[PDB]
Amino acid sequence: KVQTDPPSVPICDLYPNGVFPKGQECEYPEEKKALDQASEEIWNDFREAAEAHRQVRKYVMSWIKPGMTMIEICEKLEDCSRKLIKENGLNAGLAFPTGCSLNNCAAHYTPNAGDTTVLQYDDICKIDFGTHISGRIIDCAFTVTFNPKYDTLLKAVKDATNTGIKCAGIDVRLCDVGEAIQEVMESYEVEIDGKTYQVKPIRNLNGHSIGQYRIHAGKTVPIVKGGEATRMEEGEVYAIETFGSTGKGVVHDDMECSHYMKNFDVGHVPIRLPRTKHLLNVINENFGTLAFCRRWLDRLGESKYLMALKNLCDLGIVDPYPPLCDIKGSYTAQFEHTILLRPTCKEVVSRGDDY
Numbered sequence: 624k625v626q627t628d629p630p631s632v633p634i635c636d637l638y639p640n641g642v643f644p645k646g647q648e649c650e651y652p653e654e655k656k657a658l659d660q661a662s663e664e665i666w667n668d669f670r671e672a673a674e675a676h677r678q679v680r681k682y683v684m685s686w687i688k689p690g691m692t693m694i695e696i697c698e699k700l701e702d703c704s705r706k707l708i709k710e711n712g713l714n715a716g717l718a719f720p721t722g723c724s725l726n727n728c729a730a731h732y733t734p735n736a737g738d739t740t741v742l743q744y745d746d747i748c749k750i751d752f753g754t755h756i757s758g759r760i761i762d763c764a765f766t767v768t769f770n771p772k773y774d775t776l777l778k779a780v781k782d783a784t785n786t787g788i789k790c791a792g793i794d795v796r797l798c799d800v801g802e803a804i805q806e807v808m809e810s811y812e813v814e815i816d817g818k819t820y821q822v823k824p825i826r827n828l829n830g831h832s833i834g835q836y837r838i839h840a841g842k843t844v845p846i847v848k849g850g851e852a853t854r855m856e857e858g859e860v861y862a863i864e865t866f867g868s869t870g871k872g873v874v875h876d877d878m879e880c881s882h883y884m885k886n887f888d889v890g891h892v893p894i895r896l897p898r899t900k901h902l903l904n905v906i907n908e909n910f911g912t913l914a915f916c917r918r919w920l921d922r923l924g925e926s927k928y929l930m931a932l933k934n935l936c937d938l939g940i941v942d943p944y945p946p947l948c949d950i951k952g953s954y955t956a957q958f959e960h961t962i963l964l965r966p967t968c969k970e971v972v973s974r975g976d977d978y
């Protein structure tokens with residue numbers, strides 16, 4: 624129909640012909656039109672996922688407020704995402720857990736069960752959540768703040784992300800994208816509680832190509848100079864994300880781990896330990912090679928699984944992705960879109976009227 628006040632209509636029911644809205648189409652910085660059209664079912668699946676992401680995030684921006692717990696925020700977001708993507712096993716669903724990393728933490732925090740963290744007025748929270756249709760994944764992310772003191776830090780990172788998006792293209796060197804992002808990001812100076820800083824890109828965080836059911840398909844997009852001159856290629860899909868910091872501009876692993884994901888290259892492994900076998904079966908049926916978090920095991924009724932999960936990590940079947948944080952007292956921000964390198968044009972598929 625039309626979407627409801629608090630969104631509840633699946634995107635696929637809003638577009639009855641099954642043709643979903645294009646994102647922003649850009650010229651790059653005959654046969655190729657036939658090539659583009661031959662993969663139209665794929666582009667269309669990304670667009671369906673991107674429209675779910677646009678409607679979910681608009682809803683989130685309407686209610687996210689200090690005083691909510693991080694668990695309340697993530698469950699209310701994920702509820703809406705499951706409804707609008709019309710969750711259906713591995714055919715449609717959430718691509719990876721809801722990041723809501725706070726303050727000096729830049730990526731890969733979501734709360735586990737029991738976490739009592741409450742969002743504060745002075746917090747800077749990176750909302751990074753993903754949707755997919757048939758494994759075509761949108762990774763798109765924005766920063767939430769309530770104090771206007773962070774406004775220039777947010778503007779720096781947004782401008783750096785849009786610069787990486789504009790520089791991207793077929794035959795562009797990945798190192799050139801990183802150099803461009805850094806030059807824009809470092810042109811910003813900010814003042815927060817009487818201290819001034821030049822914004823720095825977080826050098827050991829990266830954008831990344833995306834493959835089917837594969838959030839990180841192996842090519843990395845640097846956000847500082849000095850990276851690889853490997854080129855982007857026609858048909859590739861990238862998460863162009865940047866992270867800026869008032870700290871060292873370097874993240875380390877910190878806090879409890881919540882995010883896990885099966886190693887894409889690992890195939891069948893016979894396991895006889897009962898609890899570890901069961902948990903591997905649960906992961907294979909519900910997530911495949913998509914990332915998941917502990918809250919998502921809890922909701923499937925799993926319990927007593929932490930030792931099984933460690934076993935799978937120690938076997939190398941699953942990998943842990945702990946929160947990634949700069950130094951204590953620093954502030955980090957993130958903006959991100961997914962882009963499609965179509966034969967005829969570059970589509971910023973997750974672009975919205977918001978960012």
Ligand SMILES: *C[C@@]1(O)CCC(=O)[C@@H](OC)[C@]1(O)[C@@]1(C)O[C@@H]1CC=C(C)C
Nearest residue numbers: 719730828829830831838839882914944
């Ligand atoms: C989670 C992540 O996107 C943060 C930013 C990165 O640097 C990026 O790696 C290029 C990530 O680390 C990513 C894609 O590798 C992880 C895999 C994804 C999940 C959600 C655990």
Ligand SMILES: [Co+2]
Nearest residue numbers: 751762763764
């Ligand atoms: Co992301």
Ligand SMILES: [Co+2]
Nearest residue numbers: 762862864959
């Ligand atoms: Co990403």
